């Protein structure tokens, strides 16, 4: 039970310090781990053990307090969340709000507030309702005192009205680890454990899959991924959507397969039961031939019987982005046609616009998602040579 509790969401424009102040977070200052980070959503997790000092009180992630040497003693482990780059952050949150409980917004203090990317990332989580927030006012010690006031206020103007307007602005130093200990008290006190509840149906997002046999017992396969609901238990029966892809009339067709939960990593240990934060690695019993090479990444583990339906098209309530972030602004209404691209959960696919309605549109997917009706769905339309998300849409019945 010593798993991550919490996935903390890592935004701020480009360079503002978001990577160095996760490492100043975990401790890790070498080192790869890439190899895990999600594939649909280039997501990627980085655990920390959050501690408190008996002895001077403060908090800090290292078994040895920073500021006495005295032992700590263990509070919460929590994980923090990234993607490489704006776009994939930006689809992340729209994509898999489920997957964050709380977000810390790096803003850098020797540059106007708010920054292009800044005013999108606040938008987004906005968007999704995640109100557990933390400000790091990062590059404190690059400023003086007048404009680091100054940057501060700007801070206070921009949140205002808005899902961080109650977030604690924290003024520190990522790259020299200057006033981290106030920004993990933070951590405690405005991103808690939610009260989930443990006995609802499990369901977890699969974010990659493997074949951990040694090249050449041969163990079952392995999924990876995200429980957002419930939980598992070595032993469960998990039934897995959409399933085994097959050919009938030369068209493909899913199967959804049922297996039994062998084993279960979390938190860098086996454990019996798993839950909500950090990555899961989920043993199975399934033929290692049926999960090598990702072939299960952005399906949907559930209990048999209580997962939510796959979809072969989706009707989706549309809601385009007031994006700010190469000229290219003006986001163009979506037409009869047209190819997109969907994120929903982990699950990933083009999808065929193929009638519209007043603020919504149908979409013929390549490849089914198991998705529950109200899931949001990020949309991107490929602008020239890459894709950009163009807004969200809510599945409905
Ligand atoms: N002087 C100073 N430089 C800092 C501080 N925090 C980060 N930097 C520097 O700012 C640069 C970008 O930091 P980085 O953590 O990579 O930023 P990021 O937000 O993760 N970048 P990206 O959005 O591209 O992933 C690096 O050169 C880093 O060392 C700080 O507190 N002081
Ligand atoms: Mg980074
Ligand atoms: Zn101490």
Same mark, same amino acid.
């Given at each position: 039970?010593?798993?991550?509790? $919490?996935?903390?969401?890592?935004?701020?424009?480009?360079?503002?310090?978001?990577?160095?102040?996760?490492?100043?977070?975990?401790?890790?200052?070498?080192?790869?781990?890439?190899?895990?980070?999600?594939?649909?959503?280039? =997501?990627?997790?980085?655990?920390?053990?959050?501690?408190?000092?008996?002895?001077?009180?403060?908090?800090?992630?290292?078994?040895?307090?920073?500021?006495?040497?005295?032992?700590?003693?263990?509070?919460?482990?929590?994980? /923090?969340?990234?993607?490489?780059?704006?776009?994939?952050?930006?689809?992340?949150?729209?994509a898999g709000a489920s997957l964050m409980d709380g977000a810390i917004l790096v803003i850098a203090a020797n540059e106007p507030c708010p920054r292009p990317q800044t005013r999108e990332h606040l938008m987004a989580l906005q968007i999704?309702?995640?109100?557990?927030?933390?400000?790091?006012?990062?590059?404190?010690?690059?400023?003086?005192?007048?404009?680091?006031?100054?940057?501060?206020?700007? =801070?206070?103007?921009?949140?205002?009205?808005?899902?961080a307007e109650n977030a604690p602005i924290i003024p520190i130093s990522a790259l020299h680890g200057a006033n981290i200990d106030v920004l993990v008290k933070a951590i405690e006190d405005f991103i808690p454990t939610p009260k989930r509840?443990?006995?609802?149906?499990?369901?977890?997002?699969?974010?990659?899959?493997?074949? $951990?046999?040694?090249?050449?017992?041969? $163990?079952?396969?392995?999924?990876?991924?995200?429980?957002?609901?419930?939980?598992?238990?070595?032993?469960?029966? =998990?039934?897995?959507?959409?399933?085994?892809?097959?050919?009938?009339?030369?068209?493909?067709?899913?199967?959804? =397969?049922?297996?039994?939960?062998?084993?279960?990593?979390?938190?860098?240990? /086996?454990?019996?039961?798993?839950?909500?934060?950090?990555?899961?690695?989920?043993?199975?019993?399934?033929?290692?031939?049926?999960?090598?090479?990702?072939?299960?990444?952005?399906?949907?583990?559930?209990?048999?019987?209580?997962?939510?339906?796959?979809?072969?098209?989706?009707?989706?309530?549309?809601?385009?982005?007031?994006?700010?972030?190469?000229?290219?602004?003006?986001?163009?209404?979506?037409?009869?046609?047209?190819?997109?691209?969907?994120?929903? *959960?982990?699950?990933?696919?083009? *999808?065929?616009?193929?009638?519209?309605?007043?603020?919504?549109?149908? $979409?013929?997917?390549?490849?089914?998602?198991?998705?529950?009706?109200?899931?949001?769905?990020?949309?991107?339309?490929?602008?020239?040579?890459?894709?950009?998300?163009?807004?969200?849409?809510?599945?409905?019945?």
């Amino acid at each position: 039970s010593r798993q991550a509790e $919490v996935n903390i969401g890592m935004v701020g424009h480009v360079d503002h310090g978001k990577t160095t102040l996760t490492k100043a977070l975990t401790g890790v200052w070498t080192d790869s781990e890439e190899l895990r980070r999600g594939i649909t959503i280039k =997501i990627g997790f980085a655990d920390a053990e959050i501690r408190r000092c008996p002895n001077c009180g403060r908090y800090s992630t290292s078994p040895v307090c920073p500021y006495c040497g005295h032992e700590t003693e263990f509070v919460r482990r929590v994980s /923090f969340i990234d993607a490489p780059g704006h776009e994939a952050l930006m689809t992340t949150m729209l994509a898999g709000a489920s997957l964050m409980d709380g977000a810390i917004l790096v803003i850098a203090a020797n540059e106007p507030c708010p920054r292009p990317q800044t005013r999108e990332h606040l938008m987004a989580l906005q968007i999704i309702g995640q109100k557990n927030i933390i400000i790091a006012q990062n590059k404190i010690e690059l400023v003086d005192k007048e404009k680091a006031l100054e940057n501060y206020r700007q =801070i206070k103007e921009f949140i205002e009205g808005t899902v961080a307007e109650n977030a604690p602005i924290i003024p520190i130093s990522a790259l020299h680890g200057a006033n981290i200990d106030v920004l993990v008290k933070a951590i405690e006190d405005f991103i808690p454990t939610p009260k989930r509840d443990p006995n609802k149906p499990p369901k977890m997002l699969v974010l990659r899959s493997f074949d $951990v046999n040694k090249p050449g017992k041969l $163990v079952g396969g392995v999924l990876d991924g995200s429980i957002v609901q419930g939980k598992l238990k070595v032993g469960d029966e =998990i039934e897995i959507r959409p399933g085994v892809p097959y050919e009938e009339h030369g068209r493909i067709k899913y199967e959804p =397969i049922t297996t039994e939960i062998v084993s279960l990593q979390a938190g860098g240990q /086996f454990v019996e039961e798993a839950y909500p934060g950090g990555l899961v690695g989920v043993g199975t019993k399934l033929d290692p031939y049926l999960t090598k090479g990702d072939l299960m990444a952005g399906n949907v583990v559930g209990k048999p019987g209580k997962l939510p339906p796959v979809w072969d098209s989706l009707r989706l309530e549309v809601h385009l982005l007031e994006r700010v972030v190469e000229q290219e602004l003006k986001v163009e209404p979506i037409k009869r046609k047209e190819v997109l691209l969907l994120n929903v *959960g982990t699950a990933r696919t083009m *999808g065929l616009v193929t009638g519209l309605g007043k603020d919504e549109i149908e $979409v013929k997917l390549q490849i089914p998602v198991c998705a529950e009706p109200g899931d949001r769905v990020a949309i991107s339309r490929q602008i020239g040579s890459r894709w950009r998300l163009i807004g969200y849409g809510i599945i409905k019945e």
